[PDB]
Each structure stands twice: as C-alpha cells, then as structure tokens.
Design a protein around this ligand. Sequence first.
Ligand code: ACP
Ligand code: ACP
Ligand code: MG
Ligand code: MG
Ligand code: MG
Ligand code: MG
Lengths: 280, 280
Amino acid sequence: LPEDPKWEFPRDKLTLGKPLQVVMAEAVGIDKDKPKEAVTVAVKMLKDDATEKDLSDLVSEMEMMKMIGKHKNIITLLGACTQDGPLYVIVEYASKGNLREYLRARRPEEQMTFKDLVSCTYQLARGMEYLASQKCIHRDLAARNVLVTENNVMKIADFGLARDINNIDYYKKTTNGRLPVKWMAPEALFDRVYTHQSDVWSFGVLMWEIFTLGGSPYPGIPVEELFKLLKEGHRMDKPANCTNELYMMMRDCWHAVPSQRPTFKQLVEDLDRILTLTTN
Amino acid sequence: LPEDPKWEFPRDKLTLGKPLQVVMAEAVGIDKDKPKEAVTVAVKMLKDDATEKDLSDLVSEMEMMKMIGKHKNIITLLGACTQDGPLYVIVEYASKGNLREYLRARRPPEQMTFKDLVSCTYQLARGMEYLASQKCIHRDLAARNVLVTENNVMKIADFGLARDINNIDYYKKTTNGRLPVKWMAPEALFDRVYTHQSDVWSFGVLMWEIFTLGGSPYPGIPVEELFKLLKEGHRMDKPANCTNELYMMMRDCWHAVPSQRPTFKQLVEDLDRILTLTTN
Ligand SMILES: Nc1ncnc2c1ncn2[C@@H]1O[C@H](COP(=O)(O)OP(=O)(O)CP(=O)(O)O)[C@@H](O)[C@H]1O
Ligand SMILES: Nc1ncnc2c1ncn2[C@@H]1O[C@H](COP(=O)(O)OP(=O)(O)CP(=O)(O)O)[C@@H](O)[C@H]1O
Ligand SMILES: [Mg+2]
Ligand SMILES: [Mg+2]
Ligand SMILES: [Mg+2]
Ligand SMILES: [Mg+2]
C-alpha cells in the first residue's frame, strides 16, 4: 500500500479503545498545532474474518475521503496508519451516535422540534451539495450513515460505497448490486447507472427517516416486491408531523425521471428558505 | 421466483419466532408423514436493508441445498416459501448453535474430551467428502459455519457462497473476493481458481479452530499481512493438547501446492483410524 506522508499517522501515538468495524481511540498530536494533546477519535479497521473486498472497500473509503476534502457536514478524515501493519482509517469521533438511533432516542431524551428536523435536513443537503460538487456519488445515504456530533452537527459518514462519478461500470449487470434496496433509485437497478440524481432519490428516503424520527422505510413491504411497486408508481405516504411542503420535496426527490428530480443545489435553497421562515 | 412444488411450504403453517438473517420458527406439517405435527425449525430471510446481492445469495444458497441432497453432516433443507411474499428458506434447527460458540462454552472452567474433538473433525470430513462427490465447493468453511444438533451431530451450514465446481470464473480478478482471508487457500486469490483442494486448506484452519476450542486463526496477524507470511512458509502453531499426528494433518492441508494436500477421502480414512484407536 502506497505511502501518503500527508495523511500518515504514527501507530505508537494511537491507543485503541472500546467498540463503537469501528473502535474509539486516543490519538496524540493528531491535531498538529497541539503535538502533545490526546484526541478522542474513531478508528475503522478490518474484522478478523474480513474478505479481500472488505479490504479494497476500506482503502476506497479512505481515498474517497481524501478526494472529497473537508466540509462542516461531512465526517472528517484525520489520518491513517497504512504502513507496516493493519490499515487504520482515523476519523472524527461523533459522540451522539448515528442519526437513526439519535432520532429514535428522542421520540415522544430531549424531544426534537419541527425546526430541529428541518435544520437536520438542511445540514445534510449542504453536505451532499458539496459532495456532489466534488464529483462524488455516495450511494449509501441513510440515517444509519449519518453521524451526529456533541453540538448536534449533522455529518454524512460511511463512504464505504462512494465512488467518483466517472468510475462506474455503465450498464454492467454487477453494478450497484451492493446498495441497500429500499434507499436505492430505480435506475440504479433497472439500468445499472448512478448519477448525482440517484443520490437525491436516497436523500428523499433519508428525509422520510428523519421526519418519522428514524422510522423504517416502506413498512411491511419486503424488498422482494419493492421494485415492482416502485415501477407501478408506489411511494411512501406523508409522515405525520411533517409539512405538506416538505413531503412535496420528498416526492420531488422520488420522481421516476432522474433529471426531473431537484439538484442538491436547489434542495439547499428551498430548505434554507423554509428554515429561515420557520425560525422567524 | 419459479414455482417448485416439491419444496414449497404454506406460509400460513409457519409461525416466525425469535432471532438466532435467521430466526427460529414453528412449522406445522413440515414433516409430510406427520401432517398435524408442529416442528421447531430455522428460517433464513432477507433483512430490511438487504441489497440485491443478498437476495441472489439467499436464492443461490437455497438452490445449492436442493442440489446437494441430504446427508448426515450437512444442515438439511426442509422447504421454502417462495411465492407471493418474502423468500423464506426453512432448514432444520440445530439446538446447540454454531460450533465456534459450542467449543468456547465448553472450554476448561461440560468439557470436550479428546475423542469428542476427533469425532467432530471426522464427522465434518465425512460431510466435506460427500459435498465434493456432488461437485460442490463450499468456499466458506469455518467453525462459525458449522451447526451442532441436540445429539452433537456436526452439520456443515451457510451455503451462501457455495458453488457448483463449474460455476467459478477462473482467472478473473473478481473471483473469490468475498471469502474470509484467514480461512482462504492461496490459489483462491493468487490464481483466481477454486477446487475441492481449496476447501481442504479451509478444513485445515477449521481443524485448528476445533483443537484450540474455538480459537481465532493467526492470532495477532492482520489480514493485510497474512499472504506475505504464508508465501514465506508461515503456518499456525500446534494447538495445545493436540497430537503431533493431528498437527501434521493440519500442516498437510496447508501445503502450498493444492495436489500435495490430502483429499477429503484420505482425511476421512485417517481421522477414522485415529478416532477408532482413541476409542480402544
Ligand atoms: N466516527 C464515528 N463516531 C461515532 N460512532 C461511529 C463513528 N463511525 C462509526 N460509528 C458507529 O458505528 C456504526 C457503523 O459505522 P459505519 O456505518 O461506518 O460502519 P461500517 O462501514 O463499518 C459497516 P456497514 O457498512 O454495514 O454499516 C455507526 O452507525 C455508528 O454507530
Ligand atoms: N439452523 C440453525 N439452527 C440454529 N442456529 C442457527 C441456524 N442457522 C443459523 N443459526 C445461527 O445463526 C448464525 C448465523 O447463520 P449463517 O451462517 O447462516 O449466517 P448468514 O449467512 O445469515 C450471515 P454470515 O454470512 O455473515 O454468517 C449461526 O452461526 C448460528 O448461530
Ligand atoms: Mg453504515
Ligand atoms: Mg460501510
Ligand atoms: Mg455464516
Ligand atoms: Mg452467509
């Protein structure tokens, strides 16, 4: 595995901790301006029974994070141990766990206000807008893949399936075979393609998970019959305690025709518009 | 999915239970001779966040089990619900759980005798011998994939990666990419092939797991560093309280040259001798 001095971190300065596969850890001087300060981080590494694909996925994940760059709503890559030893991808520790658990925790913890839910959505849109601008497709957008920091900042995570928009085996039968079906854009399966508009479809599902406070999509419908239903025009109903406007946004994301779905840019504008009104 | 009468089972006769993905369940009349008799079984079905590949694997697993036929040391297929609903693959319920959990729970403070261990290995060899005569390659042999019945009968399970000997794409970079590295034969990755002798290498690691009472293979050695070490002749050490003879058997399974490894038949005959001589 190539040596990338820019991101390399000393193994001796990293102390593995409890489980969060991902484990918590203490990294000394991970923050270069504080050479002697120990920081609590999260480390992703291979499981003892890992496969070859698990290895290339982890490497790919690391590289995608390097390419993407830093952003307020994207879990931060801090460093990596790639030489003489097991691969460790060191990222920022999110003390509140993943979004899905966070939301169910405060179901009617401190309950979520309508505005909170909107802010949450807004923050995620911003991250995907930036992500999309960096020519990256996530492919695994879901509440379970969103982390929430101590200050309740939303952070898109788990880049285990992310790709560069240009690195996709267009039309091959084996493409997009590992994406959770219920968060998947129809074209991703039927035509074996994946564009930024495919990610917005998933964003739609994510919006539904958020406003239902971590609910499970297409409740009662097995993945086996989901695609026949999606093909017939079936869409999830509006979450209670959710605005008609917001649900319309969700539906927009789920337009059968990819190019008829809004862009992340347009989504951010509309959400910001709504957020400003709700907080005024 | 195509209708397959001989194997179909009525959904209204099955009552799903707790988790064991797999769950326990009661199947009324699954035993044709006992039409009103309810039987405790196991059911494998897709998770709510399953991928397309998960579905093809479940289907593949089911078909492999139909083709293999019944055998004493192989988890037996009982039936399946493949129509108008989520796919359920019904298999016999093994009350003692998987072999790995089984051995660990019986470590020195119901301990395992040396004969029990040899007996376990022998049974598994017989199962693999049969499988090979059916032109089947399991590809995922390991203690976590062996189930033990109420009468301590060993049963090879989880045919989620199994293939007909001819259904392997030799030389392709994508072949064998989903096999746990620590139980995988070098030719599997290096040459991108898979034969019964590749399963023998796996059986060897399984032997080590058994004699270490559920221990983890290559302890302290990361997966990304294993193959380099194997090429250099590294091999796990003899498990404590393991005879040099059984250890030599393990070592023979780990020969770098596939044809220098014993065949499952040779393993069965040797284990039969050792087991018999221990008994007397
Ligand atoms: N930086 C971090 N801070 C806090 N918790 C984290 C974390 N990274 C991961 N986790 C926890 O671990 C869970 C799994 O993380 P992640 O989604 O990256 O897993 P993974 O890629 O290893 C497996 P899978 O693809 O099946 O989810 C998260 O949902 C969260 O609970
Ligand atoms: N017939 C059965 N009776 C009892 N327990 C069973 C069982 N089938 C499965 N289990 C339990 O469930 C565990 C996982 O089963 P299995 O190996 O089939 O997993 P899986 O294919 O769903 C996922 P993976 O490939 O990650 O293991 C077993 O190790 C065992 O503890
Ligand atoms: Mg995840
Ligand atoms: Mg992942
Ligand atoms: Mg298994
Ligand atoms: Mg499996």
